[PDB]
């Protein structure tokens, strides 16, 4: 494998807003994508898994969507705890590369 | 069961839409598959449905006389068309078949949800 890039490295916006981040592949990945959450000095936090799948506990204004090469994040409406960094993995083989990610920011 | 739906787009409140939700990985039954919209920062809701055996229509209070549906069993696929469309039918529409139209105790089904093509209303 994976050489990942992703566009905005960084974002403003406001409560309620409608954000996006896209994360390219240089060749087929199929759509098994991952979203991920990250709050400065805690835990990462996960929102979707497979780029389809909403999981149990996380709300459903995070939605994903994209197959092939191009994939996107979409956020209904921004909340208070969205304000965080994004990330986007594949597991096919075991090397393990990393990417640089996003950041929002109040405006 | 996997359940892809398209047909969406941008149009005026009035003018007519017809989507579709095609069922794939679905054995052949008399799956009754309703719908559901959702608006940003609140739960869930349920609009409608139409069990087996053809006929058997139902809807809810304010989505009455205004909805025309047809079902093919034959191409694993649905065609619904709307009439007097409004500025609250802004909507992502899923269809769910609940997947268990048993003969015996044939409600309490489990839904299950697809993917859905989003319908933008403005005037």
């Known amino acids: 494998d994976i050489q990942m890039t992703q566009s905005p490295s960084s974002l403003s916006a406001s409560v309620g807003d409608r954000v996006t981040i896209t994360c390219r592949a240089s060749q087929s990945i199929h759509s098994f994508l991952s979203w991920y959450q990250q709050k400065p000095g805690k835990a990462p936090k996960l929102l979707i898994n497979s780029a389809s799948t909403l999981q149990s506990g996380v709300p459903p204004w995070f939605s994903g969507s994209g197959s092939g090469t191009d994939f996107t994040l979409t956020i209904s409406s921004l909340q208070p705890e969205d304000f965080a960094t994004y990330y986007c993995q594949q597991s096919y083989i075991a090397p393990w590369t990393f990417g640089q990610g996003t950041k929002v920011e109040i405006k | 069961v996997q359940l892809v739906e398209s047909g969406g787009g941008l149009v005026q409140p009035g003018r007519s839409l017809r989507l579709s939700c095609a069922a794939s990985?679905?054995?052949?039954?008399?799956?009754?598959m309703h719908w559901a919209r959702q608006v940003p920062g609140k739960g869930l809701e349920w609009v409608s449905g139409?069990?087996?055996?053809?006929?058997?229509?139902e809807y809810a209070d304010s989505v009455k006389g205004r909805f025309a549906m047809s079902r093919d069993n034959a191409k694993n696929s649905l065609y619904l068309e709307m009439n007097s469309l409004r500025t609250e039918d802004t909507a992502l529409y899923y269809c769910?078949?609940?997947?268990?139209?048993?003969?015996?105790?044939?409600?309490?089904?489990?839904?299950?949800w697809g993917q859905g093509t989003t319908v933008t209303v403005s005037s």
């Open positions: 990985g679905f054995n052949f039954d008399d799956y009754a």
């Open positions: 769910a078949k609940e997947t268990t139209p048993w003969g015996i105790y044939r409600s309490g089904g489990l839904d299950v």
């Open positions: 139409i069990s087996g055996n053809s006929g058997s229509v």
